[PDB]
């Protein structure tokens, strides 16, 4: 599923991401835009053989099991394919664990390079929330 901007904002708000660990909703929408272009089915392989999955590009090196990342962890206790669903629940719940692990949203390279320090409120401007 390719979300619209305000559609995704509303779904992320319903799932408790607005101001989660102090990160306002626009931060999460901005991260999703540049990680996946709002596409739940996005995948990208990494140099070390791990793969990033879904709207927030969560990495099989640490967070999910895809059966093809030897020596990795599965800290969200899910198959990586669950992060590709049109229902964003699994991605949101895993993202909550990630952002709580000490490094905040710096875990998302695209957030650090394209959202951090910008006017992220623009990503939810005009949306009925």
Secondary structure of 47-86 in the HEC alphabet?
Answer: CCCCEEECCCCEECCCCCECCCCCCCCCCCCCEHHHHHCC
Active-site residue 7, yes or no? Answer: no
Both tokens of 61, joined, read 């090196």
Shortest reach from residue 65's CB to Na ion, in Å: 5
Active-site residue 18, yes or no? Answer: no
**87 contacts which partner out of Cl ion, Na ion, none, CB within 5 to 8 A by kind?**
Cl ion
Shortest reach from residue 25's CB to Cl ion, in Å: 5
Name residues contacting Cl ion, limited to 37-76 (CB under 5 A).
69
CB 3 within 8 A of CB 38: yes
Shortest reach from residue 83's CB to Cl ion, in Å: 13
By DSSP bridging, strand 43-45 and strand 58-59 are unpaired
18 belongs to an annotated ligand binding site: no
**81 contacts which partner out of Na ion, Cl ion, none, CB within 5 to 8 A by kind?**
none
Contact flag: residue 72 with Na ion (CB under 5 A): yes
Give the whole-angstrom CA distance, residue 25 versus residue 20.
8
The catalytically annotated residue of 52, 66, 87, 119 is 52
Give the whole-angstrom CA distance, residue 99 versus residue 102.
7
Give the annotated binding-site residues for substrate.
101
What residues make contact with Cl ion under the rule CB under 5 A? 5, 24-26, 69, 87, 104, 121
Q: Which sequence positions are flagged as catalytic?
A: 35, 52
């Amino acid at each position: 599923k390719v979300f619209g901007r305000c559609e995704l904002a509303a779904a992320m708000k319903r799932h408790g991401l607005d101001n989660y660990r102090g990160y306002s909703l626009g931060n999460w929408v901005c991260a999703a835009k540049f990680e996946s272009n709002f596409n739940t089915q996005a995948t990208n392989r990494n140099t070390d053989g791990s793969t990033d999955y879904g709207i927030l590009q969560i990495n099989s090196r640490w967070w999910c099991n895809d059966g093809r990342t030897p020596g990795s962890r599965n800290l969200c206790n899910i198959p990586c394919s669950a992060l590709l669903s049109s229902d964003i629940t699994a991605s949101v719940n895993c993202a909550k664990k990630i952002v709580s692990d000490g490094n905040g949203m710096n875990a998302w390279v695209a957030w650090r390079n394209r959202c951090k320090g910008t006017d992220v409120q623009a990503w939810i401007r005009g949306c009925r929330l």
